[PDB]
Amino acid sequence: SDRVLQLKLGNSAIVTQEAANYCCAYGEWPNYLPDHEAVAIDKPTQPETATDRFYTLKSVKWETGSTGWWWKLPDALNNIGMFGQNVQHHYLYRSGFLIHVQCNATKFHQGALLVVAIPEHQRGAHNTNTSPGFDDIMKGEEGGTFNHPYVLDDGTSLACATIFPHQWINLRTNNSATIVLPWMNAAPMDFPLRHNQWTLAIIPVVPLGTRTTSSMVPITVSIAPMCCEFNGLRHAIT
Amino acid sequence: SDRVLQLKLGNSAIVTQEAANYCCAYGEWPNYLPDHEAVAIDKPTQPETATDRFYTLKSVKWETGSTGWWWKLPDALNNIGMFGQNVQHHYLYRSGFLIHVQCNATKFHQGALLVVAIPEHQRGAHNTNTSPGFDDIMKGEEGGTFNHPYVLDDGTSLACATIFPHQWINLRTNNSATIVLPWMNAAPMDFPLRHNQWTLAIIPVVPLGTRTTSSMVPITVSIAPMCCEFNGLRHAIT
Amino acid sequence: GVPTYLLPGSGQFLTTDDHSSAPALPCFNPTPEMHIPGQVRNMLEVVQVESMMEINNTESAVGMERLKVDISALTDVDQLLFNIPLDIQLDGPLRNTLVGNISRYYTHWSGSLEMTFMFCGSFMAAGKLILCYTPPGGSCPTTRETAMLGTHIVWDFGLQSSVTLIIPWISGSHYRMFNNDAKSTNANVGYVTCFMQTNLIVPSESSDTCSLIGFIAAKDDFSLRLMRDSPDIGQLDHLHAAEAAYQ
Amino acid sequence: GVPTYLLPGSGQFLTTDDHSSAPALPCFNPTPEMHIPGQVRNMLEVVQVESMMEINNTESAVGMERLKVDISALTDVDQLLFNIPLDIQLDGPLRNTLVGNISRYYTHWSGSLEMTFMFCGSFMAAGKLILCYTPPGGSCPTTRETAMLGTHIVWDFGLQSSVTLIIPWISGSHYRMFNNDAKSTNANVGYVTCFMQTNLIVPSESSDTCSLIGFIAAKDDFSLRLMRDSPDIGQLDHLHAAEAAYQ
Amino acid sequence: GTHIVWDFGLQSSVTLIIPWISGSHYRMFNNDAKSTNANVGYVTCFMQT
Amino acid sequence: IESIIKTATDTVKSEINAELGVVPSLNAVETGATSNTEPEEAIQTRTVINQHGVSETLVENFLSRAALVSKRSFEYKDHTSSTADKNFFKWTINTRSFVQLRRKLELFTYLRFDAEITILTTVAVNGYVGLPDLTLQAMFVPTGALTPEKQDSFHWQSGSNASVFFKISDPPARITIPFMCINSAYSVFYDGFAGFEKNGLYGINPADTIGNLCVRIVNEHQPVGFTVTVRVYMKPKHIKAWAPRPPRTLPYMSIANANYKGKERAPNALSAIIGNRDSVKTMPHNIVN
Amino acid sequence: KWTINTRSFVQLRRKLELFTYLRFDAEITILTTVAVNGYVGLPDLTLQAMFVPTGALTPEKQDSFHWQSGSNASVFFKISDPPARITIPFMCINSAYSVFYDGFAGFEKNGLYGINPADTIGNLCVRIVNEHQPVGFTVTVRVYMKPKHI
Amino acid sequence: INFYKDSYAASASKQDFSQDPSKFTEPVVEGLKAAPVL
Amino acid sequence: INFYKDSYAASASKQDFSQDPSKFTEPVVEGLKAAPVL
Ligand SMILES: CC(C)Oc1ccc(C(=O)Nc2cccc3c(-c4ccc(CN)s4)ccnc23)cc1
Ligand SMILES: CC(C)Oc1ccc(C(=O)Nc2cccc3c(-c4ccc(CN)s4)ccnc23)cc1
């Protein structure tokens, strides 16, 4: 049962043979906006399979000195495929996300990644009064690296980060993690270029180690937007 | 339907072949004073067709430099026909009004008149602390001219004057305007020589223009008092 | 007697409080009510009445001239004619309007706007205009094929003098704020632009230049919230004769 | 009028009082409620979520390194691996945990704790551990055959990565206190100790050293009482830009 | 495009379906491979990890 | 048609149209009707169930908040040598002196309401001795009643005038005055003259005359002087309003009239109400990235 | 003038920051205390607090006509009174306040990071209504907030 | 709470939700259609 | 005791004893068993 999984969305599918169940954030599932919660009165476009499909980001190398990695949503996808085109042509966006994180190694490797989805991960800067600037936050498809993962770069606590939706990749146990994120905002829709609802954080709480011959151990991130809606059609900001 | 109109009151009738519907101010129609609102206990005279008929004022010439024109009611009619005689012999008056404004030009002319009936158009003076005097206000049959139509001569706003009962004469569209005014006062009757309930304002928001040979383009005002009642018979002030 | 204790806020004068208070004139009979035309019961009835926009708010437009926009025949296709700033909080063509003035007594707003334009050229004048609303996020469009991607109406001059562009309520939040930071994501509405769809075409005996009057009103989906002192009026001194009331 | 008299406490401002008070904005309509994921209604829901213990709170453990314990193959039987101080009031591995941080807003506590340990060695690594809870009264046990007399679980590494030790509520009183006197009979919980039950055994190609992550949560028999200011935060000065709010 | 992410495991083998995506009912076995009546597109394999 | 409106209207979903003879976006402004084009007719819409209340724009709520109508400072001292408000003042009651209330009231032609009056008193020592807890008397003097000449005149015996006595240590004194016009509504504007001769005041309806507020300190003077300031607040309540008006744009000049000058340059100049922009093609706060 | 915020005193800040979104009404208690400048007794002054929403004009002077408060909510209170108290409703333009905001406040890139524009309350303006005395005093105003209906 | 004998002493009456905006927006004698208005 | 006309003026509402801790403790799509979890 819990160990094998197939995810199919649009023209894309993923199989894993070493899942550890999967997380639905706060027990919710993505849905479209109902009429009794709607604000914008124009008829939304709902592209379905053109947007609601897995996009794969660039892989990152797991190293002995890694501090961990982060990507902000929708920012990381705002330039990718038909999701990106709808983002650029529309004032308002709403979606959930399906996050699938991939990392495999041999039975002689050890290491543990915390895979945590943080809502409203407002970052702090270290050792300054000046707030983080636009280019510190808006990393896009490449994402960022943690400066001080021990405090989640926000004066807080890695140890208590399990309060957020999460899984672990413990290389002994499993080689993938899956989190389903609902829409998570104070408004029913948002401008996708100035606010990120979710941050995916991948942090190596136990470092990668082995005594076999070393290999590159990549971590790969695949994200499917779910139930995408767009409102306020205009020219592309792009 | 909406383009042609005939108005018949007493021995007088007006036809127009280019109306733009007509306005009933605040959706009311003129009526006589009912017993449950009456104050003065003497039996009123109700002259009917002797008073409730169109009186035509002197025409004004529309010019390139015109600021617009105004007439106060009942003041403009207080010396005309049997309406004027009843005004002069009676302490108290009440009526509605039917206002019909006339202006025609060729299909090569352009221009737009705002025709607005203002209740209690208390005028200001420009650039002085001294209030307007009697001869600034009481223009009679001739009416007055706007000094600063942009602020309606009362420190206010032509742009927001559409909050009052109004029509436009847009020379492309129509050549007459009609407004029906009910009795509009805080008291059920009034002394007609010291208070004006209504001011007719005609303001050329778009100026008269053409490249045909020029002609005199007059604006003509016809007003019918409606449901006239008079109380407190005495000698004529006259 | 009844045992009692006073709470915080005892003895305060709150200007928005709502209590009964002692009648100074006992047994006074007010004047009977009389029917008066034009009773208003909600201020939203006033903002639904369309009123002229001051679109030509330019130097050398004086007084009444600021309430109209003059259009001429062009020799280049699809040219921009004018744009309208949609800021009700910052000074602009919408401020001195019935919807504008009443809304500036409030802080929060929601709902659709209508702009109506009346063509006031001669009967022989012809033309087509495109009026575009662009939702916020980028710069105001300067070309027709950019503005055409937004919400728009193509207006042909004819027997009906006037066209409406609806500005639909398109917003992430339930309300926007009348914020002095016009570029705030909680405040910016976007832009209205007018382009030639064809051209203004007139015969020799018509005037070569024609005017638009623009009007704005709220629709009945419109709502206002959080009352405030309007910045439209103020005084630095006592008014003339205000002192004489003490003399 | 009604005869009345004021009681003691009339006019006081008690910060935990519970009265209605005058609405400053009459007829204001708040924004409609919208469903948001993750509503919390009792703080006990948060303390039931397991969070990492800082067991390796030693000098030369920096940052993330403090959240794991490294285990190696030994050549002596039944050796002690680590102990966990159970003081939530005094600084120790439990303080910066979800149960810890929320509990430090309160003075009294009752109920069972769970510690979960995840083994993060390679698949080829094998071993058995014994995890012991000792009820209070004496010193922390330093030998396995002493610790074995308390409450314990013997953990075999396998396909299931993680074991729970329950710390059951064993107390004379209904509640304990978060007391700075850790040796008080109203406060001391006792000890958790980990020993080798067998040995960590790994092949040459696995890493010779492996890590445990320890987690703690409350069970749903857990209760907190008497709210207090948490000693986890404080300020000696105004914050940066707090003054600028007056400028 | 259309894809499957394959994790090696106890099940040895993965299927990629090439679905019939065509404007016409049929394609031709045409020696002009670049003809719009003939070209099917491409299959590519990349490292996911 | 009259209806009970508690919330903003719902939006219904709409389809593509393309119907001959139907042109809901065309209008005729010349009729004087406002555009009836609905959003569902201009664009394709979704369904929106709209829960926004409209109660904060009720006319009762818009006007019924307390605003300053009168503010007078006077010397509380031995006045034998003064030439001045000698421990009392008289105020002729009006709503035209403070512009925030004035502009709101002048949005309407007729208003009927009762007036909740709050009297706030504050004291400062003249240039310290502590502040005396004085007793004040406010007395309402209707039309044709005699106003007090002195702090201690027998007019203050108030046999039939309404008086309120209040301490500085009290909460603000509060009373309600009924709607007291001799007409069914107050005339906020009056296009008329107050008397039967030609010299009467323009612009004030005689029917709306309230009277005088006379305020004294009841205490005899102390050996040292103080300055006492009285503030009067009025809240309209039980309001009816008729015939809404274009708002005031130019600064008020006088309490006696609507006279106007404008600011020296825009905003709110007589030549230009809105501040200028470089052209009708210039967007002043244009977003650029 | 004070620009209203919850971030200045750390005990309340840390408790609020345990959550991502909060919806509540704010019970506000205003406590005033006075000391003589370096004795004459303490004056029983009247204070005016006025709430100035976004886009309303703030007072420039103790006696500016902004204090006439035609449409702003004001409370007048004495130092001898119990603390002044009022409730402010939940006033966000969203269904909840954003305690944290991973976003930027404006459509250009230079807007503030980390503050949701939707949660702007406004300004609290407090004056002494009394004219000055011949001698100086120091007046301290303390504002307390209690969330309710959370 | 109102123990005064005069009804004008009462607190404000904020319950009148009747509107008729057509008396300002549509004072035309023949009603508009949803259809050429002229 | 609440004589104010606005319901937000009322005292605090301390009566909501509904909990669902599983949305934080058990957000797994297939529920745990009391039984090997993997
Ligand atoms: C002494 C005490 C027992 O009685 C009183 C009596 C009156 C006052 C006082 O200032 N009232 C007032 C101050 C300001 C205005 C008014 C109004 C207005 C309604 C419409 C207007 C336009 N013209 S004006 C009516 C009644 N009052 C008013 C204070 C105390
Ligand atoms: C003058 C009198 C009549 O009205 C007032 C009005 C306001 C005040 C005052 O300080 N309120 C307040 C002080 C501190 C915080 C707030 C909040 C917040 C909720 C979430 C926040 C995060 N951003 S902030 C909301 C409303 N208020 C607040 C005092 C008196």
PDB file of N, CA and C in Angstrom, chain F residues 65-66 68 73 98-100 104 120 122-128 131 168-171 227 229 231 233 286-289, chain G residues 40-46 65-66 68-73 76 78 107-109 127 129-135 137:
ATOM      1  N   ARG F  65     -22.932  61.900  13.909  1.00  0.00           N
ATOM      2  CA  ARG F  65     -21.756  61.900  14.758  1.00  0.00           C
ATOM      3  C   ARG F  65     -21.484  63.329  15.205  1.00  0.00           C
ATOM      4  N   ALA F  66     -21.008  63.473  16.440  1.00  0.00           N
ATOM      5  CA  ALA F  66     -20.894  64.779  17.080  1.00  0.00           C
ATOM      6  C   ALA F  66     -19.752  65.602  16.496  1.00  0.00           C
ATOM      7  N   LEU F  68     -17.940  69.710  16.335  1.00  0.00           N
ATOM      8  CA  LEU F  68     -17.807  71.013  16.973  1.00  0.00           C
ATOM      9  C   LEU F  68     -18.591  72.092  16.222  1.00  0.00           C
ATOM     10  N   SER F  73     -13.361  81.053  24.140  1.00  0.00           N
ATOM     11  CA  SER F  73     -12.503  81.282  25.298  1.00  0.00           C
ATOM     12  C   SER F  73     -12.783  82.648  25.906  1.00  0.00           C
ATOM     13  N   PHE F  98     -17.822  75.934  11.459  1.00  0.00           N
ATOM     14  CA  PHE F  98     -16.756  74.948  11.303  1.00  0.00           C
ATOM     15  C   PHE F  98     -17.035  74.097  10.074  1.00  0.00           C
ATOM     16  N   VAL F  99     -16.076  74.074   9.147  1.00  0.00           N
ATOM     17  CA  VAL F  99     -16.344  73.708   7.758  1.00  0.00           C
ATOM     18  C   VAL F  99     -16.639  72.222   7.576  1.00  0.00           C
ATOM     19  N   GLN F 100     -16.116  71.352   8.439  1.00  0.00           N
ATOM     20  CA  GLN F 100     -16.351  69.922   8.259  1.00  0.00           C
ATOM     21  C   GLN F 100     -17.825  69.571   8.413  1.00  0.00           C
ATOM     22  N   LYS F 104     -20.763  68.740   5.129  1.00  0.00           N
ATOM     23  CA  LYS F 104     -21.644  67.573   5.187  1.00  0.00           C
ATOM     24  C   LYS F 104     -23.119  67.959   5.173  1.00  0.00           C
ATOM     25  N   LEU F 120     -18.345  70.769  26.447  1.00  0.00           N
ATOM     26  CA  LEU F 120     -17.054  70.409  27.025  1.00  0.00           C
ATOM     27  C   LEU F 120     -16.340  71.677  27.487  1.00  0.00           C
ATOM     28  N   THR F 122     -12.873  73.412  29.514  1.00  0.00           N
ATOM     29  CA  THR F 122     -11.492  73.240  29.939  1.00  0.00           C
ATOM     30  C   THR F 122     -10.968  74.575  30.459  1.00  0.00           C
ATOM     31  N   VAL F 123     -10.014  74.525  31.387  1.00  0.00           N
ATOM     32  CA  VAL F 123      -9.538  75.731  32.062  1.00  0.00           C
ATOM     33  C   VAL F 123      -8.013  75.726  32.137  1.00  0.00           C
ATOM     34  N   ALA F 124      -7.415  76.902  31.965  1.00  0.00           N
ATOM     35  CA  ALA F 124      -5.988  77.118  32.164  1.00  0.00           C
ATOM     36  C   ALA F 124      -5.759  78.351  33.030  1.00  0.00           C
ATOM     37  N   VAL F 125      -4.742  78.280  33.890  1.00  0.00           N
ATOM     38  CA  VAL F 125      -4.307  79.428  34.680  1.00  0.00           C
ATOM     39  C   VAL F 125      -3.631  80.465  33.796  1.00  0.00           C
ATOM     40  N   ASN F 126      -3.943  81.734  34.036  1.00  0.00           N
ATOM     41  CA  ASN F 126      -3.262  82.817  33.343  1.00  0.00           C
ATOM     42  C   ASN F 126      -1.850  83.006  33.878  1.00  0.00           C
ATOM     43  N   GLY F 127      -0.926  83.311  32.976  1.00  0.00           N
ATOM     44  CA  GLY F 127       0.451  83.559  33.355  1.00  0.00           C
ATOM     45  C   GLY F 127       0.671  84.954  33.901  1.00  0.00           C
ATOM     46  N   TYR F 128       1.728  78.731  38.892  1.00  0.00           N
ATOM     47  CA  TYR F 128       0.654  77.755  38.833  1.00  0.00           C
ATOM     48  C   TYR F 128       0.036  77.545  40.208  1.00  0.00           C
ATOM     49  N   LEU F 131      -6.068  73.894  39.247  1.00  0.00           N
ATOM     50  CA  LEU F 131      -7.228  74.271  38.449  1.00  0.00           C
ATOM     51  C   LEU F 131      -8.509  74.226  39.267  1.00  0.00           C
ATOM     52  N   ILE F 168     -16.905  71.524  35.932  1.00  0.00           N
ATOM     53  CA  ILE F 168     -15.733  71.151  35.150  1.00  0.00           C
ATOM     54  C   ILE F 168     -15.256  69.734  35.459  1.00  0.00           C
ATOM     55  N   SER F 169     -15.387  69.284  36.707  1.00  0.00           N
ATOM     56  CA  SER F 169     -15.057  67.903  37.044  1.00  0.00           C
ATOM     57  C   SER F 169     -16.065  66.882  36.524  1.00  0.00           C
ATOM     58  N   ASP F 170     -17.271  67.295  36.146  1.00  0.00           N
ATOM     59  CA  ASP F 170     -18.220  66.366  35.558  1.00  0.00           C
ATOM     60  C   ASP F 170     -17.735  65.864  34.200  1.00  0.00           C
ATOM     61  N   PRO F 171     -18.278  64.745  33.732  1.00  0.00           N
ATOM     62  CA  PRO F 171     -18.347  64.495  32.289  1.00  0.00           C
ATOM     63  C   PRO F 171     -18.998  65.663  31.572  1.00  0.00           C
ATOM     64  N   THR F 227      -8.197  81.324  32.199  1.00  0.00           N
ATOM     65  CA  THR F 227      -8.870  81.281  30.908  1.00  0.00           C
ATOM     66  C   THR F 227      -9.725  80.022  30.828  1.00  0.00           C
ATOM     67  N   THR F 229     -12.286  77.812  28.381  1.00  0.00           N
ATOM     68  CA  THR F 229     -12.717  77.533  27.014  1.00  0.00           C
ATOM     69  C   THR F 229     -13.917  76.593  27.030  1.00  0.00           C
ATOM     70  N   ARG F 231     -16.424  74.396  24.558  1.00  0.00           N
ATOM     71  CA  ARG F 231     -16.644  73.765  23.261  1.00  0.00           C
ATOM     72  C   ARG F 231     -18.031  73.134  23.204  1.00  0.00           C
ATOM     73  N   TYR F 233     -20.580  70.701  20.979  1.00  0.00           N
ATOM     74  CA  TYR F 233     -20.693  69.671  19.955  1.00  0.00           C
ATOM     75  C   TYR F 233     -22.156  69.380  19.659  1.00  0.00           C
ATOM     76  N   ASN F 286       2.041  56.475 -13.067  1.00  0.00           N
ATOM     77  CA  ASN F 286       2.218  55.307 -13.912  1.00  0.00           C
ATOM     78  C   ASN F 286       3.200  54.310 -13.299  1.00  0.00           C
ATOM     79  N   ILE F 287       2.796  53.039 -13.253  1.00  0.00           N
ATOM     80  CA  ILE F 287       3.666  51.967 -12.781  1.00  0.00           C
ATOM     81  C   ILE F 287       4.728  51.686 -13.833  1.00  0.00           C
ATOM     82  N   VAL F 288       5.990  51.675 -13.425  1.00  0.00           N
ATOM     83  CA  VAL F 288       7.084  51.342 -14.328  1.00  0.00           C
ATOM     84  C   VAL F 288       8.021  50.354 -13.649  1.00  0.00           C
ATOM     85  N   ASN F 289       8.439  49.345 -14.400  1.00  0.00           N
ATOM     86  CA  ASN F 289       9.343  48.312 -13.920  1.00  0.00           C
ATOM     87  C   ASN F 289      10.369  48.012 -15.000  1.00  0.00           C
TER      88      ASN F 289
ATOM     89  N   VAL G  40       3.442  71.293  42.462  1.00  0.00           N
ATOM     90  CA  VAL G  40       2.287  72.170  42.336  1.00  0.00           C
ATOM     91  C   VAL G  40       0.966  71.420  42.382  1.00  0.00           C
ATOM     92  N   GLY G  41       0.976  70.112  42.604  1.00  0.00           N
ATOM     93  CA  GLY G  41      -0.181  69.288  42.330  1.00  0.00           C
ATOM     94  C   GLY G  41      -0.297  68.923  40.861  1.00  0.00           C
ATOM     95  N   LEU G  42      -1.148  67.960  40.593  1.00  0.00           N
ATOM     96  CA  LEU G  42      -1.316  67.436  39.243  1.00  0.00           C
ATOM     97  C   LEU G  42      -2.608  67.925  38.610  1.00  0.00           C
ATOM     98  N   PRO G  43      -2.550  68.510  37.415  1.00  0.00           N
ATOM     99  CA  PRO G  43      -3.774  68.994  36.766  1.00  0.00           C
ATOM    100  C   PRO G  43      -4.626  67.852  36.224  1.00  0.00           C
ATOM    101  N   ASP G  44      -5.940  67.995  36.378  1.00  0.00           N
ATOM    102  CA  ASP G  44      -6.922  67.074  35.800  1.00  0.00           C
ATOM    103  C   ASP G  44      -7.242  67.480  34.360  1.00  0.00           C
ATOM    104  N   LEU G  45      -6.314  67.164  33.463  1.00  0.00           N
ATOM    105  CA  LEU G  45      -6.420  67.545  32.059  1.00  0.00           C
ATOM    106  C   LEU G  45      -7.470  66.734  31.297  1.00  0.00           C
ATOM    107  N   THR G  46      -8.003  67.345  30.243  1.00  0.00           N
ATOM    108  CA  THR G  46      -8.805  66.656  29.239  1.00  0.00           C
ATOM    109  C   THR G  46      -7.934  66.325  28.031  1.00  0.00           C
ATOM    110  N   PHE G  65      -7.621  72.864  13.003  1.00  0.00           N
ATOM    111  CA  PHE G  65      -9.019  72.552  12.754  1.00  0.00           C
ATOM    112  C   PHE G  65      -9.272  71.087  12.398  1.00  0.00           C
ATOM    113  N   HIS G  66      -8.241  70.277  12.150  1.00  0.00           N
ATOM    114  CA  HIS G  66      -8.454  68.833  12.042  1.00  0.00           C
ATOM    115  C   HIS G  66      -9.096  68.246  13.298  1.00  0.00           C
ATOM    116  N   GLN G  68     -11.507  69.317  14.946  1.00  0.00           N
ATOM    117  CA  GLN G  68     -12.957  69.465  14.982  1.00  0.00           C
ATOM    118  C   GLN G  68     -13.694  68.160  14.666  1.00  0.00           C
ATOM    119  N   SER G  69     -13.020  67.180  14.052  1.00  0.00           N
ATOM    120  CA  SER G  69     -13.455  65.775  14.007  1.00  0.00           C
ATOM    121  C   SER G  69     -14.873  65.590  13.460  1.00  0.00           C
ATOM    122  N   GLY G  70     -15.151  66.209  12.317  1.00  0.00           N
ATOM    123  CA  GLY G  70     -16.490  66.110  11.756  1.00  0.00           C
ATOM    124  C   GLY G  70     -16.924  64.683  11.459  1.00  0.00           C
ATOM    125  N   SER G  71     -16.005  63.847  10.979  1.00  0.00           N
ATOM    126  CA  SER G  71     -16.313  62.464  10.636  1.00  0.00           C
ATOM    127  C   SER G  71     -15.338  61.449  11.201  1.00  0.00           C
ATOM    128  N   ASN G  72     -14.156  61.853  11.648  1.00  0.00           N
ATOM    129  CA  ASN G  72     -13.320  60.957  12.429  1.00  0.00           C
ATOM    130  C   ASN G  72     -13.991  60.632  13.761  1.00  0.00           C
ATOM    131  N   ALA G  73     -13.772  59.415  14.241  1.00  0.00           N
ATOM    132  CA  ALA G  73     -14.111  59.060  15.614  1.00  0.00           C
ATOM    133  C   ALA G  73     -13.075  59.639  16.576  1.00  0.00           C
ATOM    134  N   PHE G  76     -12.991  61.890  24.009  1.00  0.00           N
ATOM    135  CA  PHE G  76     -12.505  62.862  24.981  1.00  0.00           C
ATOM    136  C   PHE G  76     -12.570  62.242  26.370  1.00  0.00           C
ATOM    137  N   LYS G  78     -10.860  62.420  30.644  1.00  0.00           N
ATOM    138  CA  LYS G  78     -10.118  63.098  31.696  1.00  0.00           C
ATOM    139  C   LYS G  78      -9.064  62.183  32.291  1.00  0.00           C
ATOM    140  N   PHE G 107       3.110  47.759  -6.551  1.00  0.00           N
ATOM    141  CA  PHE G 107       3.296  47.210  -7.891  1.00  0.00           C
ATOM    142  C   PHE G 107       4.680  47.462  -8.470  1.00  0.00           C
ATOM    143  N   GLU G 108       5.401  48.460  -7.992  1.00  0.00           N
ATOM    144  CA  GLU G 108       6.809  48.589  -8.320  1.00  0.00           C
ATOM    145  C   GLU G 108       7.660  47.749  -7.364  1.00  0.00           C
ATOM    146  N   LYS G 109       8.936  47.594  -7.703  1.00  0.00           N
ATOM    147  CA  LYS G 109       9.847  46.760  -6.924  1.00  0.00           C
ATOM    148  C   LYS G 109      10.313  47.378  -5.614  1.00  0.00           C
ATOM    149  N   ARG G 127      -4.088  64.665  21.600  1.00  0.00           N
ATOM    150  CA  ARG G 127      -3.716  65.984  22.088  1.00  0.00           C
ATOM    151  C   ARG G 127      -4.216  66.174  23.511  1.00  0.00           C
ATOM    152  N   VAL G 129      -6.296  68.856  25.328  1.00  0.00           N
ATOM    153  CA  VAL G 129      -7.259  69.854  24.883  1.00  0.00           C
ATOM    154  C   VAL G 129      -7.063  71.179  25.613  1.00  0.00           C
ATOM    155  N   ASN G 130      -6.683  71.135  26.884  1.00  0.00           N
ATOM    156  CA  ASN G 130      -6.338  72.338  27.626  1.00  0.00           C
ATOM    157  C   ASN G 130      -5.216  73.109  26.944  1.00  0.00           C
ATOM    158  N   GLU G 131      -5.347  74.431  26.943  1.00  0.00           N
ATOM    159  CA  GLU G 131      -4.224  75.339  26.756  1.00  0.00           C
ATOM    160  C   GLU G 131      -3.112  75.034  27.751  1.00  0.00           C
ATOM    161  N   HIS G 132      -1.883  75.415  27.432  1.00  0.00           N
ATOM    162  CA  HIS G 132      -0.791  75.202  28.370  1.00  0.00           C
ATOM    163  C   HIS G 132      -0.975  76.034  29.638  1.00  0.00           C
ATOM    164  N   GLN G 133      -0.483  75.490  30.742  1.00  0.00           N
ATOM    165  CA  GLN G 133      -0.365  76.181  32.017  1.00  0.00           C
ATOM    166  C   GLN G 133       0.897  77.039  32.032  1.00  0.00           C
ATOM    167  N   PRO G 134       1.094  77.868  33.065  1.00  0.00           N
ATOM    168  CA  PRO G 134       2.373  78.594  33.185  1.00  0.00           C
ATOM    169  C   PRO G 134       3.581  77.709  33.464  1.00  0.00           C
ATOM    170  N   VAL G 135       3.398  76.479  33.932  1.00  0.00           N
ATOM    171  CA  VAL G 135       4.503  75.571  34.210  1.00  0.00           C
ATOM    172  C   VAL G 135       4.315  74.318  33.365  1.00  0.00           C
ATOM    173  N   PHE G 137       4.509  70.197  32.356  1.00  0.00           N
ATOM    174  CA  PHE G 137       4.265  68.857  32.864  1.00  0.00           C
ATOM    175  C   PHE G 137       4.729  67.849  31.824  1.00  0.00           C
TER     176      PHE G 137
END
